Structure 1
């Protein structure tokens, strides 16, 4: 289960430079250690700050404001694969940011074969109104009075032998 963390670093302030830029970003990780490692990697890559002169001011966990509210999430993702790195944008209809990022990671590992090692979450934002969604598969669930069945349900059997010839009707 993923979790959202906030990490800030200001590169061990020295003489003549008190309170540096104080780089701030949000990191999604399953634990504090992984969040700190990802923050260090992002600082090394995007910025010129390394752990040699770095410092973790504070790490905090951010909880989604409305864990029971359905939202459409627009995520900008930059990931690396066998080919060169390129930007990517996707839209996810989920309830919480953590679930949306988890689904994005699962899709990337499934379709693009990209795993957590080479995936960067640039930004996660909520789409407020309809007709701003640019993906058809997300617009699919926005239709008014959406009703559909669940044909051919895969019923589970607790016994090897069943004297019923079960039907998959729903």
Structure 2
């Protein structure tokens, strides 16, 4: 729930003599360590299949490192979340370098705007919007123009010492 890692979690039902070799199930899971990952795998599984962990086991847990972690990407993010009065589905886009990067601002962005803590949010699907102009949310289309350049008006150099023998300039 913090600095995020992405996990594959592969699990299954406990084998019965009647059903040796039950079917294996997988999720991609974003958590900060692997304990929370495994715990999340059950949370969801319990809501999809009829299973609790006391009646199942976790087969594998492997980290999914970003394939091209220095290529800037436009992400599609689908989300299901709880407001104070309803629960809702929600699409938004995020431009970043990795999935793990993206999800973290996703998780912050949900708190900033809709005041949604981590607990009240399900990450439905996340995906690299292949062809630009499949980007729809303007606040990313805005960065896609040819030869995009912009200044950073009003520079504010932080100070090392509390007194200054000159009136500062903000000029970048």
Q: TM-score by structure 2 length?
A: 0.94
Whose strand proportion is higher, 1 or 2?
Answer: 2
How many angstroms does 1:81 deviate by? Answer: 2.5
Moved more, 64-73 or 121-130: 121-130
Deviation at 1:49, TM superposition (A): 1.6
Per-residue CA distance 1:95-153 (angstroms, 9 max, x = gap): 00000000100101111111111111111110111110010111000011111110011
Deviation track 1:18-46 (CA, whole Å, cap 9, x = no partner) reads 33231211000000001011111111223
Alignment of 1:48-127 (within 5 A): 48-127=50-129
TM-score where L is the length of structure 1: 0.95
Q: Secondary structure at the match of 2:78?
A: strand
Q: Does 2:23 correspond to 1:25?
A: no
Q: Distance in 2 between matches of 1:60 and 1:106?
A: 25
Where structure 2 has 5 or more consecutive residues not aligned to the other structure, the ranges are: none
Structure 1 runs, 4 residues or longer, greater than 6 Å off: none
- Return 14-23 or 52-61, whichever deviates more: 14-23
Q: Pairwise CA RMSD of aligned residues? A: 1.1
What is the total number of aligned residue pairs between the two structures?
A: 170
Question: What is the rounded CA distance, in whole Å, between the counterparts of 2:164 and 2:62 in structure 1?
Answer: 53
Query: What is the alpha-carbon distance in structure 2 between the residues aligned to residue 80 and residue 20 of structure 1?
Result: 34
Out of 11-20 and 89-98, give the one that drifted further.
11-20
